[PDB]
Amino acid sequence: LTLGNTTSSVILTNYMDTQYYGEIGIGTPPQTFKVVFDTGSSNVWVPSSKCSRLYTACVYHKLFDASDSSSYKHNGTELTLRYSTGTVSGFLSQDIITVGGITVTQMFGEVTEMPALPFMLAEFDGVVGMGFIEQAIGRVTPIFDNIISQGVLKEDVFSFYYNRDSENSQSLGGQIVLGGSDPQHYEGNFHYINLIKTGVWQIQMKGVSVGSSTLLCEDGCLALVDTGASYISGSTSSIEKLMEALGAKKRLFDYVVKCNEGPTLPDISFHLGGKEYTLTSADYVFQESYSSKKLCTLAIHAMDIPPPTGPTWALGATFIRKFYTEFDRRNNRIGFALAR
Numbered sequence: 001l002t003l004g005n006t007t008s009s010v011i012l013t014n015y016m017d018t019q020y021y022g023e024i025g026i027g028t029p030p031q032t033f034k035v036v037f038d039t040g041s042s043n044v045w046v047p048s049s050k051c052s053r054l055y056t057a058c059v060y061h062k063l064f065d066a067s068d069s070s071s072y073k074h075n076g077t078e079l080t081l082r083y084s085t086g087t088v089s090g091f092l093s094q095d096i097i098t099v100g101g102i103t104v105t106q107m108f109g110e111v112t113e114m115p116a117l118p119f120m121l122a123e124f125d126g127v128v129g130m131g132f133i134e135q136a137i138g139r140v141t142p143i144f145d146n147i148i149s150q151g152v153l154k155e156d157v158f159s160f161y162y163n164r165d166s167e168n169s170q171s172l173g174g175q176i177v178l179g180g181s182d183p184q185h186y187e188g189n190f191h192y193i194n195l196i197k198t199g200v201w202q203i204q205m206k207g208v209s210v211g212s213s214t215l216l217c218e219d220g221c222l223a224l225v226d227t228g229a230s231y232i233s234g235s236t237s238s239i240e241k242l243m244e245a246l247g248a249k250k251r252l253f254d255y256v257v258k259c260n261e262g263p264t265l266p267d268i269s270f271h272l273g274g275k276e277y278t279l280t281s282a283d284y285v286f287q288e289s290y291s292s293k294k295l296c297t298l299a300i301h302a303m304d305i306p307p308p309t310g311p312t313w314a315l316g317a318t319f320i321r322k323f324y325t326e327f328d329r330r331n332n333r334i335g336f337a338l339a340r
């Protein structure tokens with residue numbers, strides 16, 4: 001490990017509080033893609049020129065064209081990438097990738113199979129896995145390892161700020177710091193939790209309270225800290241119980257409550273390390289209305305993550321909105337501070 005004196009930031013766009021993406025460039029000259037920075041995965045992919053326009057997703061996203069890059073290096077190894085919500089398929093390529101100020105040689109997937117559902121609903125083109133080589137499909141070096149290799153980053157850490165949505169155009173949707181934190185976006189002190197293990201951004205969670213009573217994960221459980229999850233997620237059994245406690249009806253893909261009932265819904269806490277991390281109903285309800293007649297989604301849903309990572313809680317954007325999160329690869333731990 002070699003440390004320099006460079007901090008590098010990635011400005012992020014907040015789509016509807018569910019999609020947080022920033023811009024990278026690939027090739028000479030650069031081709032730009034909107035990408036989700038996903039601690040729950042370890043590959044880079046963007047859609048490919050070689051994707052059939054029979055995938056309507058590829059018609060509606062930026063496509064990497066290797067025939068327009070003078071820094072492309074062929075590989076052509078196939079790979080399938082499996083995500084919580086959908087699956088993509090293609091082949092491996094090498095090129096120069098620009099992220100913040102930093103230029104790195106990176107192996108990445110050219111995706112050629114991009115299902116209409118759900119990629120038609122994606123503001124973003126691709127994904128930059130911020131996880132560990134142990135999770136990388138085709139055991140490819142993840143972009144963060146490659147930047148650390150360059151010995152320019154002041155620290156072997158990266159931090160996430162996820163703003164609330166804003167009408168105002170001049171609002172900052174989010175910020176990734178590579179090699180640091182931005183003290184302009186948190187307050188009080190970081191509180192750290194060491195990982196179950198190296199190779200996954202997962203930590204021991206002691207309890208979930210719904211207002212008064214610890215009626216979930218009573219013994220102890222797993223929390224994946226997943227900058228690529230829109231929501232906080234537990235396992236079908238954890239949730240259909242959580243929601244029964246809240247008084248929430250179960251729709252096909254999410255839980256809802258009558259909008260009128262939303263604001264008085266109880267606090268939800270998360271025992272991580274020392275501190276108890278609490279969310280108000282404001283923090284976990286899409287309060288889009290106050291009418292008893294209309295229905296309001298909650299930012300918590302069922303996610304059955306398969307082993308060996310699963311089953312686990314996923315703490316995504318619902319949680320990171322309140323808690324500025326610092327991923328410390330140096331000491332294998334996650335820092336949390338109160339966001340501002």
Ligand SMILES: *[C@@H]1O[C@H](CO)[C@@H](O)[C@H](O)[C@H]1NC(C)=O
Binds near residue numbers: 074075076077
């Ligand atoms: C693809 O890259 C891998 C890993 O760096 C390399 O060892 C392999 O031989 C490459 N395959 C081709 C066909 O270029």
